[PDB]
Write a protein that binds this DNA or RNA. Structure first.
Ligand SMILES: *O[C@H]1C[C@H](n2cnc3c(N)ncnc32)O[C@@H]1CO
Ligand SMILES: *O[C@H]1C[C@H](n2cc(C)c(=O)[nH]c2=O)O[C@@H]1CO
Length: 95
DNA sequence: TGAAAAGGGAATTGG
DNA sequence: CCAATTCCCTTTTCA
């Protein structure tokens, strides 16, 4: 009996779709899947991610961005050439 | 002028 | 052994 936990891209996509923590992350170009983190309030979302996963240490945005870097391999999220800006693969977005 | 932002290697670990 | 987590290292920017 192995318990399921959220993946980072799901956590973030759920935040965006529901308009939660809109002070910490927001759509920049929603039709294109492009979103961006708040420069001042991103660590609050980071801590919320750590709690969500029940990790032993406090989650910081450095460790969160470090995690996002690995998605370059599988392609669910890529970094965009804009400050604290990222992009979801379009197969995660409606038509 | 140092915090922030951007990369990175790799050992680790819950499940 | 995935899917991050954790820790540490770098360079570049600019507020
Ligand atoms: O101690 C040096 C460096 C520091 N300082 C702060 N902001 C600076 C900019 N924009 N250019 C150069 N030096 C900067 O103050 C002293 C120089 O005035
Ligand atoms: O492919 C490897 C790793 C895999 N493995 C090992 C262990 C200890 C575990 O808990 N899960 C798991 O999938 O088994 C193969 C042999 O070690």
């Amino acid at each position: 009996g192995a318990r399921k936990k959220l993946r980072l891209y799901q956590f973030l996509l759920g935040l965006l779709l529901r308009g939660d923590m809109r002070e910490c992350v927001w759509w920049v170009e929603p039709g294109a899947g492009v979103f961006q983190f708040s420069s001042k309030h991103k660590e609050l979302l980071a801590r919320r991610w750590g709690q969500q996963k029940g990790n032993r240490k406090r989650m910081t945005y450095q460790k969160l961005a470090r995690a996002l870097r690995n998605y370059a391999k599988t392609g669910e999220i890529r970094k965009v050439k804009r400050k604290l800006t990222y992009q979801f693969d379009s197969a995660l977005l409606p038509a």
